[model samples]
Target chain A: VDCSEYPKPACTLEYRPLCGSDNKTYGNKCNFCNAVVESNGTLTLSHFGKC
Target chain B: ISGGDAIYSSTGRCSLGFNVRSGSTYYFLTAGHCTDGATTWWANSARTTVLGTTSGSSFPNNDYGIVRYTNTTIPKDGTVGGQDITSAANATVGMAVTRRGSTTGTHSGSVTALNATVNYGGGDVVYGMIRTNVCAEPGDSGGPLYSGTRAIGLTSGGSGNCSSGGTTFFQPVTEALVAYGVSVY
Candidate 1:
């Protein structure tokens, strides 16, 4: 929901896993971009805990 | 003997899950994707040994299915390929695990994460999956994911092959057991 509070430049500390709209779990908000690119920009953060 | 054993349908082949019972009825759990392919199941390709039929199935959001065993002659051994499934338990990250599948036989790995989600596209999204470093291939779907004598999950799907190594996900057996009102023995 609130993408503004996520990693701005890059994630420093590990352990902030996020669930993308594509249903894949990302280790962090930065890594979530992989799904965003793969889905051709349709993916976004869904929720935490591999949602 | 137990999980990795192959079961066939009119459409394709898949591995079996934990042997379960509810009252006098016997059943087995498997991947919903496999059940979505067909209804009837056979122990052999010849379709001689009637394993059972798909009593209930759930997919997309989850990936697990229940098959009612109609044949009384089939041995309801808790040993899947002699792995000995004793009980069903929830998956935990970093836990050592093994999976027995028809395609790749038995492979051992560790749980990488918990409550993971995977999208197979076309609205086929699964939630609360156990992500592991274990590798799998086609025909492995619906196999058992276990740790020692405890049953953990049912093989769902993932990328990569056994030879090259890949990440695979599983549907927690506990969820299926609770959903179907069955117990593994």
Candidate 2:
């Protein structure tokens, strides 16, 4: 019988970018952690492809 | 040492299974699911050091993967979550065991079945697994499943959590060692 837990420390150098609700572009998964909180409604993933 | 160590990929996190080698060339074992669709392992969150790259991955039937050690001859010393380990051995039903992981630490359980099979849905069915009552989480995948100092299995998957208890599955160490022609370090 079987069945089935991230503060990313390191991320890929591959720059598959993302655009956040904060309107800022994130370079990688690790860089997403460094993003500051948005003042308006809170930052969230807005784009899988970079802005 | 290297076994049960927390390792990361660009896509997600998982734990190492064991340090192994085929002759002089060194490698490590982990869950195939963990290595699937990913390459390039990092030792830390900041990507400060390269761990290794996947050499092989087998899942949906068997659940095992081997990665060749590339970054260091300084690669590892070999332990399970910092505890010293000796040999890899086959497990039996009803043998009590402890598992180590990067996310969930350690948990104890007993082997409930051998030659077990599990379906992760959509044809992700792995056969010949060691089934147990241990609890494991996401990042715990590819960690160590051992009893005493003897290596037993690699964290496969299961249902439930440590807080409330769970049933888990393992890919027997002996099979992986044989499949890859490697031995525990």
Candidate 3:
């Protein structure tokens, strides 16, 4: 699986919604990747939608 | 006033990298941490000169970002403070290099290691960084890391300062160029 994340993410104004394997919607792919990276490659992309 | 020159956002400040382009459009590369903090950027602290907006940014796993140039008046030359930038090259251990940041200006040093990994605590682990003995400070983030005419990396975070001395890391410039489909000319 392609996993990524950041411990301290800089704030972004643009919106690029992404759904996580954890069944939660993140603000963008960067945030989702942050969770996956912090998860040690456990979390992953579930889909693409916050709405 | 060049690559090491100061660029400001409402949030903080950082140094500029090489002036790049994607076909007709122009952009510049910097630290993702810098771009991630704010959407808009400026060439001055007074916020009168508009630089551009954050186009793309990455951190932790990598630490690079791109800013699209919105102001046509600003020269989009590939020179950092008069140092003409020609190309993006990979960092080699023991290679002599120099960096220019907003706070510290220009300083010279050698590359300590290539593909270095830095952990900024709390799980902020950045890979493929160029480790160096060159000193840097807080506002130096996203500055130019170059060797003569060759563009090398972007300033990331590190400990200490130019006064007492310290080690620093850089996000390789080649990676950012490739990621953004941009060229340094």
DockQ of each: 0.03, 0.05, 0.03
What is residue B124's positional error in candidate 1, in angstroms?
0.6
Which pairs clash inside model 1?
B2-B79, B2-B80, B2-B81, B3-B80
**Candidate 2 chain B: worst-modelled 10 consecutive residues by lDDT:** B116-125
True contacts kept of each: 0.00, 0.00, 0.00
List ranges where model 2 is wrong by over 4 Å: A1-51, B73-75
Candidate 3 residue-wise lDDT, B1-185, digit = tens = 36877788777567787789999999988888778768999988689999999999897689888999899887777798888988889999999999988777899999998887777645667888888999876667888999989999999876555878878889898889899999988
By DockQ rank, best first, the candidates go 2, 3, 1
Worst lDDT 10-window in candidate 3 chain B: B116-125
Deviation in Å, model 3, residue B68 alpha carbon: 0.2
- What TM-score, computed on C-alpha atoms, does each candidate reach? 0.77, 0.77, 0.77
Q: Residue B66 in candidate 3 has what lDDT? A: 90
Alpha-carbon local distance difference test for all models: 0.79, 0.75, 0.78
Tens digits of per-residue lDDT, candidate 1, B127-181, equal 8999999987667788999999999999987765577888888999999999999
CAPRI-wise, candidate 3 is: incorrect
Q: Which tens-of-lDDT digit does each residue in A1-51 have in candidate 3?
A: 243225433322123457788887664444466567778888878888663
